[PDB]
Amino acid sequence: GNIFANLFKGLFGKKEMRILMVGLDAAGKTTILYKLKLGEIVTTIPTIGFNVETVEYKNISFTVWDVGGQDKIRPLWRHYFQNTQGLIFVVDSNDRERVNEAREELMRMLAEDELRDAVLLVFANKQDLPNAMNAAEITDKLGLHSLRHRNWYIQATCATSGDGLYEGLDWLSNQLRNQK
């Protein structure tokens, strides 16, 4: 066999990769996806179904599949676990009562043997109110250090501002890609 075509494609960039968008309802998932794809804060109704989009950055097409946090849609996340390479979780620090539910949902989703190659991606959403905690208090409460064989990275992004999205994208690219 010959791999000249593959080498030529890789000389200018061939890898695209995938990504997932999960989190509770009203957690900034749709707004975050709109900012990543378009670059504006688009106001959307609650995600009854799901949103699928792609992000072109660093020569990698980061396809994002937004998933809502509805009670009837929480168990529907197993459909997206098939043919999925990435997983990004958006936390809601503005909902103290919903923090426990979000942690339980993350533990339930992380307790699947099929979803093992998807690295952890914790997004500090709703980083605009004074009630939001730091990048370690939320992680300490969720116990992200207790995930054996899991590569998790905590990143805080402000929905109104958009700061830290580039850092999160760079971290995801560095975790997915093991080349120069």
């Binding site: 197993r78 676990f81 098939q82």
Partner: protein, 415 residues
């Protein structure tokens, strides 16, 4: 006591019909197809049907079901035997069993049907003998049918006298899912292709346990065949008296005797398979095959059928030896091995996907079947002692025989 033997088609069309007694109207065949459809759709389908006072007992062939109408309390076993004989005759005359020959060989088919059975009572069933009276391309009937010897046509002359034997073994193992083998029986098959000059009277002699005990040699390896089914040429009285296998071999290939005894030895192939099937996520097949047969024997064309998931897709096979292919038509992993040396150990690690959505209905657990066929291996240990070929003229025969070992009902119950 069949009333009319008819041959149907897959669309319900009667390819050929031949009434023998006429006690049943020919229009009753129309209700046979709807009756069969109702029985199959309600689970009541059986080889013997019943259209009111007339029963339609027949079997399904390669392309058509040979339905034979009957009205009285006729021998259903006799009808089945006649149907089997007719199927064998058709196979001998026509190399294929399909509708292509039914509509093309009607001239000879009608003559064969008329000559075979009269008034519901068959009289002639030997294909070799029948080929001398009815041809598709008429002289007086041969004296063999009228004579006592209806399986050895006289006047046969050949340049050489060579008889080829075939001791075919069938290793049938019924292994339960718990790891224990329930039905482990081996059935011998002595098929011989006799090609000599004249009508020799074969004097078969083997190393039977009963014969060794009677003669006093019951100390060496003797085959303890529970059931021995001799052919028509073999004289039942001679075998009943002193185990004398005396019979006249025919011209061509035929089954002389069929041994069948239980097996209490270790299996030739031991398969250790594991199923790491995740709940709608993935599946693992830790299949290990251990060959318990002798190292001097090689199992040519080893085909261990591993039933994979019906909805499984994107499968990956991590084996050691042998080609592993998944057949979507069969919905199983075919562990195909060309040559398997005795004592070999093959380890396989399967990995296939599964849809997230669960199936609507269960599909069951098909058993794992091995298709090993190791030639020149006599598991039962029965060896042919002598073959007394005697001819009135006097000639030196050159008999030949081969032993072939294969797997019969060698299926492994799944967990």
């Amino acid at each position: 006591s069949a009333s009319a033997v008819y041959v149907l088609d897959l669309k319900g069309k009667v390819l050929i019909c031949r009434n023998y007694r006429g006690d049943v109207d020919m229009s009753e065949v129309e209700h046979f197809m709807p009756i069969l459809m109702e029985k199959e759709e309600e689970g009541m389908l059986s080889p013997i049907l019943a259209h009111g006072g007339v029963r339609f007992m027949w079997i399904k062939h390669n392309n058509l079901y040979l339905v034979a109408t009957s009205k009285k309390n006729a021998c259903v076993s006799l009808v089945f035997s006649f149907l089997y004989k007719v199927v064998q005759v058709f196979s001998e005359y026509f190399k294929e069993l399909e509708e292509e020959s039914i509509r093309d060989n009607f001239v000879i088919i009608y003559e064969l049907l008329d000559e075979l059975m009269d008034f519901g009572y068959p009289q002639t069933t030997d294909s070799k003998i029948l080929q001398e009276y009815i041809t598709q391309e008429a002289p007086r009937p041969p004296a063999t049918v009228t004579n006592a010897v209806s399986w050895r046509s006289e006047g046969i002359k050949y340049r050489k006298n060579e008889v080829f034997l075939d001791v075919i073994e069938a290793v049938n193992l019924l292994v339960s899912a718990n790891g224990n083998v329930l039905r482990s029986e081996i059935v011998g098959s002595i098929k011989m292709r006799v090609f000599l000059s004249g009508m020799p009277e074969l004097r078969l002699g083997l190393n039977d346990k009963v014969l060794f005990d009677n003669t006093g040699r019951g100390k060496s390896k003797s085959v303890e065949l529970e059931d021995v089914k001799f052919h028509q040429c073999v004289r039942l009285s001679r075998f009943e008296n002193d185990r004398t296998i005396s019979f006249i071999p025919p011209d061509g290939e035929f089954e002389l005797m069929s041994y069948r005894l239980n097996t209490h030895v270790k299996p030739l192939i031991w398969i250790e398979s594991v199923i790491e099937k995740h709940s709608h996520s993935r599946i693992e097949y830790m299949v290990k095959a251990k060959s318990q047969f002798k190292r001097r024997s090689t199992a040519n064309n080893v085909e261990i059928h591993i039933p994979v998931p019906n909805d499984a897709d994107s499968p990956k096979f991590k084996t050691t030896v042998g080609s592993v292919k998944w057949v979507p038509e069969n919905s199983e992993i075919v562990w195909s091995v060309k040559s398997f040396p005795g004592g070999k150990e093959y380890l396989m690690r399967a990995h296939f996907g599964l849809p997230s959505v669960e199936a609507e209905d269960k599909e069951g657990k098909p058993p794992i079947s091995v298709k090993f066929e190791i030639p020149y291996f006599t598991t039962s240990g029965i060896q042919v002692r002598y073959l007394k070929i005697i001819e009135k003229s006097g000639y030196q025969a050159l008999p030949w025989v081969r032993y072939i070992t294969q797997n019969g009902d060698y299926q492994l119950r799944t967990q």
